Amino acid sequence: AITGDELRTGPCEPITFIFARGSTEPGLLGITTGPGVCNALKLSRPGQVACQGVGPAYTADLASNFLPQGTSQIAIDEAAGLFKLAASKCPDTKIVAGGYSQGAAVMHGAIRNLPSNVQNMIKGVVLFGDTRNKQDGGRIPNFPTDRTKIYCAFGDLVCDGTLIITAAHLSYGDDVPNATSFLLSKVLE
């Protein structure tokens, strides 16, 4: 019933999207990709999708980028929790996840240590401008690679260890329709 809070503040839905915004984005889903991917998912699959942002624990503050895992534990623990929440509240929901910048880091760290119960509900993961692309080798540790897609724009140097901000980092708007298709591929009807 609330935007970005539909897992927390709503009924169970056949499909549950879980998104972690990039640094300094306001809200739970931000205003860049998740907003898009969300509406895009609901449109393409009316009556089926509930979007849940990751917050407010994940502050998406800049300084957390420099922490060992590239975000905060609180943030990861938060994401972890919501995946489980889905498992608990809605055991028949097909989960799809997303992340941009540090939000991808959140997911990278939350999804890698989820039990098989929960991981097996995650059909698809999309990561834009992943800040852990090189630290984890273009994948999520301990998570099927065919279910993962990483959008790394030409010039986007955060995909390569650094935290350098280019106009290529800010372009993942363009990848929503493709990201959506990827997710939707896996979540068949």
CATH number of the domain that 149 lies in? 3.40.50.1820
Work out the burial of residue 167: count CB atoms within 10 Å of its CB; fewer than 13 is exposed, 13-18 middle, 19 or more buried. Answer: exposed
Q: How far apart are CA 98 and CA 17, in angstroms?
A: 8
Amino acid at the residue 152:
C
CA 41, CA 35: separation in Å to the nearest integer?
10
Q: How was this structure determined?
A: X-ray
Residues in the chain: 189
The answer to whether position 148 is within a domain reads yes
List the catalytic residue out of 64, 101, 130, 175: 101
Q: Residue 108 corresponds to which tokens in the numbers above? A: 């990278």
Q: Which of 176, 89, 83 is nearest to 122 (CA)?
A: 83
Residue 120 belongs to domain spanning: 15-186
Q: How many domains does the chain have?
A: 1
Pairwise CA distance, residues 55 & 4, whole Å: 9
- Long-range contacts of range 183-188, CB-CB < 8 Å, 24 or more positions apart? 183/17, 183/37, 183/41, 183/96, 183/98, 183/123, 183/124, 183/126, 184/41, 184/44, 184/45, 184/124, 185/124, 186/96, 186/123, 186/124, 186/147, 187/15, 187/45, 187/94, 187/96, 187/123, 187/124
For residues 96 and 106, give the distance between their C-alpha atoms in angstroms, rounded to a whole number: 15
88 is catalytic: no
Amino acid at 69: Q
Resolution given for this structure, in angstroms: 2.8
Q: Considering 72, 136, 169, 175, which one is annotated as catalytic?
A: 169
Is residue 116 one of the residues assigned to a domain? yes
Catalytic annotation present for 156: yes
Residue 5 placed within a domain: no
Domain membership flag for residue 6:
no
Distance of CA 57 to the CA centre of its chain: 15
